Amino acid sequence: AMGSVTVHSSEPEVRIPENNPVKLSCAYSGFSSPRVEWKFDQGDTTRLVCYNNKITASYEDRVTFLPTGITFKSVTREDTGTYTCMVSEEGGNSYGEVKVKLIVLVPPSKPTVNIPSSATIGNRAVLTCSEQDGSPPSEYTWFKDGIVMPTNPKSTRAFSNSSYVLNPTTGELVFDPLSASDTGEYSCEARNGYGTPMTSNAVRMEAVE
Amino acid sequence: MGSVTVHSSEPEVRIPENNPVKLSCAYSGFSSPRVEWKFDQGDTTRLVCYNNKITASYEDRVTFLPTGITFKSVTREDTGTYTCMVSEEGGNSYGEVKVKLIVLVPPSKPTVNIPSSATIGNRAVLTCSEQDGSPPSEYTWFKDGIVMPTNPKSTRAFSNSSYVLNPTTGELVFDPLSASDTGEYSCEARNGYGTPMTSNAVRMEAVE
């Protein structure tokens, strides 16, 4: 006795920041005695949020349950993952699955930087930025005397005599050769599109021959 | 031999760059003496006076006397031991005064490589150096401007720190690095001459 069924979610990609409650919708139809279950997924971790129309152990405190979805009370950057609703028909004639994606927003924190005081004119010169609390991740913006770093060193700018390489997601800034011209107060802001972007410590650097 | 003497009023001369200076060498006991000066520093050795005459490389600046060699100007090149050498023609007698010269050059600004950050726990090498000053530089580390105790421990307000200093390498080395070590570092270089130059203060943070 297979019936023609449906399982979908108004919000295929939810987004909300830390601590606020949030509902995850899952509207299904075609089912006479359905068994709804939610499961969690991120990286290699996978644990059930709802099992047997009941919310599992680890969530009852915060996570409530409905024919239409799971409502929370608060979240954390732990909950950032893909939620998979799963409706089956008792006995198992029919079965469907909506896959909702959650992003828990966390503004970026101050980036730690390792600009070194000096480096020799000519050899490689690795500097860095990183932050690690902002969700989504940080995109980094290098400065020099406060004048934003052109991801492109060559071409028109003013920077076209500098030998660097940037990386908006590693923050790794790498000179090669290092030039006398590169002496400057370096820094970097980290923005993830959320909250306010944090700027690191400006660190002067001198090219010593 | 006949009985002779060769000495110098100034066994260890000291004077800074560009000023003229005389090197004395008063000798006695010699009837027809052949005075010659020779230069020495490290592995370089070249004659300043040969055959009672000043050699090629010096006539411009260096003049000659029965009592010594007068200059007109010096450089940190001339910093070395000068050896006067009087012999008696034919070679019956012979003596030698050994004068030491130090040409003074104030210290220049020290280059420093304090790194922005380091991990709480592992080794943390920072540095200072200067290289124009003569005599050499003795270095003085600071932290928030509070002079570095060559001995971290030994009840100094620093016992909790784990560093090692070196007044002549400038090498400052943490091990372990502690959260406590976050600070605006710098160093002055003094060689006892002129004015001591202070490097760039570089803040440093002990992360994770």
Side-chain angles (χ1 to χ4, degrees), chain A residues 123-166:
Chain A
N123 12 124
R124 202 182 161 238
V126 182
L127 321 198
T128 52
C129 211
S130 319
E131 171 291 332
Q132 185 201 21
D133 294 84
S135 184
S138 24
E139 287 229 47
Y140 305 132
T141 333
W142 272 100
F143 289 74
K144 161 168 164 176
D145 299 340
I147 282 341
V148 174
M149 300 276 291
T151 299
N152 31 34
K154 218 72 180 68
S155 81
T156 215
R157 271 325 165 160
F159 284 32
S160 51
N161 65 10
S162 172
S163 243
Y164 73 95
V165 166
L166 280 176

Short mmCIF file of all heavy atoms in Angstrom, two decimals, chain A residues 123-166:
data_model
loop_
_atom_site.label_atom_id
_atom_site.label_comp_id
_atom_site.label_asym_id
_atom_site.label_seq_id
_atom_site.Cartn_x
_atom_site.Cartn_y
_atom_site.Cartn_z
N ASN A 123 64.80 37.45 0.81
CA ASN A 123 64.17 36.13 1.08
C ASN A 123 62.69 36.14 1.39
O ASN A 123 62.08 37.20 1.56
CB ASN A 123 64.97 35.30 2.11
CG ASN A 123 66.07 36.12 2.81
OD1 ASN A 123 66.10 36.20 4.05
ND2 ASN A 123 66.96 36.76 2.02
N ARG A 124 62.11 34.94 1.47
CA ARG A 124 60.67 34.84 1.69
C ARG A 124 60.26 35.54 3.00
O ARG A 124 61.02 35.53 3.96
CB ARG A 124 60.26 33.36 1.67
CG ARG A 124 58.77 33.10 1.37
CD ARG A 124 58.54 31.59 1.44
NE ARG A 124 57.14 31.18 1.62
CZ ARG A 124 56.67 30.43 2.64
NH1 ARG A 124 57.47 30.00 3.62
NH2 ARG A 124 55.38 30.09 2.68
N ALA A 125 59.06 36.14 3.05
CA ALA A 125 58.59 36.86 4.24
C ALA A 125 57.12 36.58 4.64
O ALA A 125 56.22 37.41 4.38
CB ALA A 125 58.80 38.34 4.02
N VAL A 126 56.86 35.45 5.30
CA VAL A 126 55.49 35.05 5.69
C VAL A 126 54.91 35.84 6.88
O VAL A 126 55.46 35.83 7.97
CB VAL A 126 55.47 33.54 6.16
CG1 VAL A 126 54.05 33.07 6.53
CG2 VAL A 126 56.13 32.61 5.14
N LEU A 127 53.77 36.51 6.69
CA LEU A 127 53.12 37.23 7.78
C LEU A 127 51.79 36.49 7.89
O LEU A 127 51.53 35.65 7.05
CB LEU A 127 52.89 38.70 7.43
CG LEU A 127 53.92 39.52 6.64
CD1 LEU A 127 53.59 40.97 6.86
CD2 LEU A 127 55.38 39.24 6.99
N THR A 128 50.95 36.78 8.88
CA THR A 128 49.66 36.09 8.99
C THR A 128 48.59 36.80 9.78
O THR A 128 48.90 37.62 10.62
CB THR A 128 49.80 34.74 9.68
OG1 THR A 128 50.49 34.91 10.94
CG2 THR A 128 50.48 33.70 8.79
N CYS A 129 47.34 36.36 9.60
CA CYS A 129 46.14 36.88 10.29
C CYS A 129 45.32 35.62 10.44
O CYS A 129 45.52 34.66 9.70
CB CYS A 129 45.28 37.81 9.42
SG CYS A 129 44.29 39.19 10.13
N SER A 130 44.38 35.63 11.38
CA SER A 130 43.49 34.51 11.61
C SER A 130 42.67 35.02 12.73
O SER A 130 43.10 35.83 13.52
CB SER A 130 44.21 33.25 12.09
OG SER A 130 45.43 33.03 11.42
N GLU A 131 41.50 34.44 12.84
CA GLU A 131 40.52 34.79 13.82
C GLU A 131 39.88 33.39 13.86
O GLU A 131 40.27 32.55 13.02
CB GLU A 131 39.65 35.88 13.19
CG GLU A 131 38.42 36.31 13.89
CD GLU A 131 37.33 35.26 13.91
OE1 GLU A 131 37.24 34.41 13.00
OE2 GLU A 131 36.52 35.30 14.86
N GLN A 132 38.98 33.08 14.81
CA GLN A 132 38.42 31.73 14.89
C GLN A 132 37.24 31.59 15.82
O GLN A 132 37.22 30.72 16.68
CB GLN A 132 39.51 30.75 15.35
CG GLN A 132 39.09 29.27 15.35
CD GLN A 132 39.98 28.39 16.27
OE1 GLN A 132 40.65 28.91 17.20
NE2 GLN A 132 40.00 27.04 16.02
N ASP A 133 36.23 32.41 15.58
CA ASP A 133 35.00 32.43 16.39
C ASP A 133 33.86 32.91 15.51
O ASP A 133 32.68 32.64 15.79
CB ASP A 133 35.12 33.40 17.59
CG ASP A 133 36.17 32.96 18.61
OD1 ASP A 133 37.39 33.26 18.44
OD2 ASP A 133 35.73 32.34 19.60
N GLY A 134 34.20 33.67 14.47
CA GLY A 134 33.21 34.19 13.57
C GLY A 134 32.66 33.09 12.67
O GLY A 134 33.40 32.25 12.18
N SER A 135 31.34 33.00 12.66
CA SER A 135 30.62 32.09 11.78
C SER A 135 29.51 32.87 11.10
O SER A 135 28.59 33.42 11.78
CB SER A 135 30.09 30.86 12.48
OG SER A 135 29.49 30.01 11.50
N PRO A 136 29.52 32.85 9.75
CA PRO A 136 30.55 32.15 8.98
C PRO A 136 31.96 32.68 9.15
O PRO A 136 32.17 33.72 9.75
CB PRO A 136 30.06 32.34 7.55
CG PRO A 136 29.52 33.68 7.56
CD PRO A 136 28.69 33.65 8.84
N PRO A 137 32.96 31.94 8.64
CA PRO A 137 34.39 32.24 8.67
C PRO A 137 34.81 33.65 8.32
O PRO A 137 34.04 34.44 7.84
CB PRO A 137 34.96 31.21 7.71
CG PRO A 137 34.17 30.00 8.12
CD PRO A 137 32.75 30.54 8.23
N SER A 138 36.05 33.97 8.61
CA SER A 138 36.51 35.31 8.31
C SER A 138 37.20 35.43 6.95
O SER A 138 37.75 34.48 6.38
CB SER A 138 37.40 35.88 9.45
OG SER A 138 38.01 34.88 10.26
N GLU A 139 36.96 36.57 6.35
CA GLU A 139 37.62 36.90 5.14
C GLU A 139 38.47 38.02 5.80
O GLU A 139 38.05 38.69 6.78
CB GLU A 139 36.64 37.34 4.02
CG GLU A 139 35.79 36.16 3.41
CD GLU A 139 35.74 36.07 1.83
OE1 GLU A 139 36.81 36.16 1.17
OE2 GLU A 139 34.64 35.86 1.24
N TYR A 140 39.73 38.02 5.39
CA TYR A 140 40.76 38.92 5.89
C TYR A 140 41.13 40.03 4.91
O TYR A 140 41.22 39.80 3.70
CB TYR A 140 42.02 38.05 6.19
CG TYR A 140 41.83 36.84 7.13
CD1 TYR A 140 42.33 35.57 6.80
CD2 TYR A 140 41.03 36.95 8.30
CE1 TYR A 140 42.02 34.41 7.60
CE2 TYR A 140 40.71 35.80 9.10
CZ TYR A 140 41.19 34.55 8.74
OH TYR A 140 40.76 33.47 9.46
N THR A 141 41.44 41.21 5.42
CA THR A 141 41.85 42.36 4.58
C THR A 141 43.16 43.02 5.10
O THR A 141 43.13 43.80 6.04
CB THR A 141 40.77 43.48 4.57
OG1 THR A 141 39.45 42.95 4.81
CG2 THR A 141 40.83 44.22 3.23
N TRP A 142 44.29 42.73 4.47
CA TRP A 142 45.56 43.30 4.86
C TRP A 142 45.67 44.81 4.61
O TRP A 142 45.09 45.33 3.68
CB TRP A 142 46.70 42.57 4.15
CG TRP A 142 47.15 41.40 4.92
CD1 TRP A 142 46.83 40.11 4.69
CD2 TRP A 142 47.98 41.42 6.08
NE1 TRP A 142 47.40 39.31 5.64
CE2 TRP A 142 48.11 40.09 6.52
CE3 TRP A 142 48.64 42.43 6.81
CZ2 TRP A 142 48.85 39.74 7.62
CZ3 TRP A 142 49.38 42.09 7.91
CH2 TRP A 142 49.48 40.75 8.31
N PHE A 143 46.43 45.52 5.43
CA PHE A 143 46.62 46.96 5.22
C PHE A 143 48.10 47.27 5.24
O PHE A 143 48.91 46.39 5.48
CB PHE A 143 45.93 47.73 6.32
CG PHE A 143 44.44 47.69 6.24
CD1 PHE A 143 43.75 46.54 6.58
CD2 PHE A 143 43.72 48.82 5.85
CE1 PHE A 143 42.34 46.51 6.56
CE2 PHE A 143 42.31 48.80 5.82
CZ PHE A 143 41.63 47.64 6.18
N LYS A 144 48.48 48.49 4.94
CA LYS A 144 49.88 48.84 4.98
C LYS A 144 49.85 50.33 5.12
O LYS A 144 49.49 51.05 4.18
CB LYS A 144 50.62 48.43 3.71
CG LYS A 144 51.90 49.22 3.61
CD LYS A 144 52.80 48.70 2.57
CE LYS A 144 53.86 49.74 2.25
NZ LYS A 144 54.84 49.21 1.26
N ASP A 145 50.13 50.81 6.32
CA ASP A 145 50.04 52.24 6.56
C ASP A 145 48.56 52.57 6.40
O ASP A 145 48.19 53.71 6.15
CB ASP A 145 50.89 52.99 5.54
CG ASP A 145 52.34 52.62 5.62
OD1 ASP A 145 52.72 52.09 6.68
OD2 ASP A 145 53.10 52.86 4.64
N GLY A 146 47.72 51.54 6.59
CA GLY A 146 46.26 51.67 6.48
C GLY A 146 45.65 51.65 5.08
O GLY A 146 44.44 51.73 4.94
N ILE A 147 46.47 51.45 4.05
CA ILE A 147 46.06 51.46 2.66
C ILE A 147 45.83 50.02 2.18
O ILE A 147 46.78 49.35 1.78
CB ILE A 147 47.18 52.25 1.84
CG1 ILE A 147 46.98 53.75 2.04
CG2 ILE A 147 47.29 51.90 0.35
CD1 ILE A 147 45.63 54.10 2.53
N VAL A 148 44.56 49.56 2.20
CA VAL A 148 44.15 48.18 1.81
C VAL A 148 44.97 47.47 0.78
O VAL A 148 45.27 47.97 -0.31
CB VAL A 148 42.62 48.04 1.39
CG1 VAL A 148 42.31 46.60 0.84
CG2 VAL A 148 41.69 48.32 2.58
N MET A 149 45.26 46.23 1.12
CA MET A 149 46.05 45.38 0.28
C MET A 149 45.32 44.82 -0.97
O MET A 149 44.26 44.18 -0.85
CB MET A 149 46.70 44.27 1.12
CG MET A 149 47.65 44.75 2.26
SD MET A 149 49.32 45.10 1.82
CE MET A 149 49.93 43.56 1.46
N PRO A 150 45.83 45.15 -2.19
CA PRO A 150 45.35 44.74 -3.52
C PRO A 150 45.67 43.28 -3.62
O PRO A 150 46.84 42.92 -3.71
CB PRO A 150 46.32 45.47 -4.47
CG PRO A 150 46.62 46.71 -3.76
CD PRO A 150 46.84 46.21 -2.34
N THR A 151 44.65 42.43 -3.60
CA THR A 151 44.88 41.01 -3.73
C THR A 151 45.87 40.73 -4.88
O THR A 151 46.60 39.74 -4.88
CB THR A 151 43.58 40.32 -3.94
OG1 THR A 151 42.75 40.56 -2.81
CG2 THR A 151 43.77 38.86 -4.09
N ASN A 152 45.86 41.68 -5.82
CA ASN A 152 46.78 41.65 -6.97
C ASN A 152 47.88 42.70 -6.87
O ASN A 152 47.68 43.93 -7.09
CB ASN A 152 46.07 41.74 -8.31
CG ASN A 152 44.81 42.53 -8.23
OD1 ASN A 152 44.70 43.51 -7.47
ND2 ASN A 152 43.81 42.11 -8.99
N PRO A 153 49.09 42.19 -6.57
CA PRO A 153 50.39 42.86 -6.38
C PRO A 153 50.88 43.54 -7.70
O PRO A 153 51.41 44.68 -7.70
CB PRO A 153 51.32 41.70 -5.97
CG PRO A 153 50.70 40.48 -6.79
CD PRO A 153 49.21 40.71 -6.60
N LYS A 154 50.77 42.79 -8.80
CA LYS A 154 51.16 43.29 -10.11
C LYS A 154 49.96 44.09 -10.62
O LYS A 154 48.96 44.24 -9.88
CB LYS A 154 51.46 42.14 -11.05
CG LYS A 154 52.63 42.44 -11.95
CD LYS A 154 53.94 42.43 -11.17
CE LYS A 154 55.15 42.75 -12.06
NZ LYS A 154 55.12 44.17 -12.54
N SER A 155 50.06 44.56 -11.87
CA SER A 155 49.02 45.37 -12.54
C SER A 155 49.01 46.80 -11.94
O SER A 155 49.80 47.09 -11.03
CB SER A 155 47.61 44.70 -12.42
OG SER A 155 46.92 44.92 -11.17
N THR A 156 48.20 47.70 -12.50
CA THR A 156 48.10 49.07 -11.96
C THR A 156 47.66 48.96 -10.46
O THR A 156 47.11 47.92 -10.03
CB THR A 156 47.11 49.99 -12.83
OG1 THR A 156 47.60 51.34 -12.85
CG2 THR A 156 45.66 50.01 -12.28
N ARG A 157 48.00 49.98 -9.68
CA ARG A 157 47.70 50.11 -8.25
C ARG A 157 48.59 51.24 -7.74
O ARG A 157 48.27 52.42 -7.87
CB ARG A 157 48.01 48.81 -7.45
CG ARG A 157 46.87 47.83 -7.38
CD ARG A 157 45.57 48.59 -7.30
NE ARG A 157 44.40 47.78 -7.57
CZ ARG A 157 43.18 48.13 -7.18
NH1 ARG A 157 43.01 49.26 -6.52
NH2 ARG A 157 42.13 47.35 -7.42
N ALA A 158 49.78 50.84 -7.37
CA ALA A 158 50.85 51.66 -6.81
C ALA A 158 51.77 50.55 -6.29
O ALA A 158 53.00 50.66 -6.38
CB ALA A 158 50.33 52.52 -5.64
N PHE A 159 51.14 49.44 -5.89
CA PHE A 159 51.76 48.21 -5.37
C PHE A 159 52.55 47.36 -6.39
O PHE A 159 53.24 46.43 -5.98
CB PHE A 159 50.69 47.31 -4.73
CG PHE A 159 50.22 47.76 -3.38
CD1 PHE A 159 50.16 49.13 -3.04
CD2 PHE A 159 49.80 46.81 -2.44
CE1 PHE A 159 49.67 49.58 -1.76
CE2 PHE A 159 49.30 47.23 -1.13
CZ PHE A 159 49.23 48.63 -0.80
N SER A 160 52.46 47.66 -7.70
CA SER A 160 53.17 46.88 -8.77
C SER A 160 54.74 46.75 -8.83
O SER A 160 55.34 46.53 -9.91
CB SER A 160 52.61 47.28 -10.15
OG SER A 160 52.59 48.69 -10.36
N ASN A 161 55.39 46.92 -7.68
CA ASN A 161 56.84 46.76 -7.54
C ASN A 161 57.06 45.85 -6.30
O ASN A 161 58.19 45.48 -5.94
CB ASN A 161 57.59 48.13 -7.44
CG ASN A 161 57.25 48.97 -6.16
OD1 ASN A 161 56.60 48.50 -5.20
ND2 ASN A 161 57.76 50.20 -6.13
N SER A 162 55.94 45.49 -5.66
CA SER A 162 55.92 44.60 -4.50
C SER A 162 55.74 43.16 -5.04
O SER A 162 54.99 42.96 -6.01
CB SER A 162 54.74 44.98 -3.58
OG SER A 162 54.53 44.05 -2.51
N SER A 163 56.34 42.17 -4.36
CA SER A 163 56.27 40.76 -4.79
C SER A 163 55.32 39.88 -3.93
O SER A 163 55.53 38.65 -3.81
CB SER A 163 57.71 40.19 -4.75
OG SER A 163 58.19 39.79 -6.00
N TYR A 164 54.24 40.43 -3.39
CA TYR A 164 53.45 39.57 -2.51
C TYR A 164 52.41 38.62 -3.09
O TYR A 164 52.28 38.48 -4.32
CB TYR A 164 52.85 40.35 -1.34
CG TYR A 164 51.71 41.27 -1.66
CD1 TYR A 164 50.40 40.84 -1.51
CD2 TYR A 164 51.95 42.56 -2.10
CE1 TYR A 164 49.33 41.69 -1.81
CE2 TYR A 164 50.89 43.42 -2.40
CZ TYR A 164 49.58 42.98 -2.25
OH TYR A 164 48.54 43.81 -2.53
N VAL A 165 51.72 37.91 -2.19
CA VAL A 165 50.68 36.96 -2.54
C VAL A 165 49.79 37.07 -1.35
O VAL A 165 50.30 37.08 -0.26
CB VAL A 165 51.22 35.54 -2.57
CG1 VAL A 165 50.08 34.52 -2.58
CG2 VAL A 165 52.19 35.37 -3.73
N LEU A 166 48.49 37.13 -1.51
CA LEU A 166 47.58 37.25 -0.38
C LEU A 166 46.74 36.02 -0.39
O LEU A 166 46.99 35.15 -1.22
CB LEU A 166 46.65 38.43 -0.60
CG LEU A 166 47.27 39.76 -0.28
CD1 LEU A 166 46.35 40.89 -0.60
CD2 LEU A 166 47.48 39.74 1.18
#
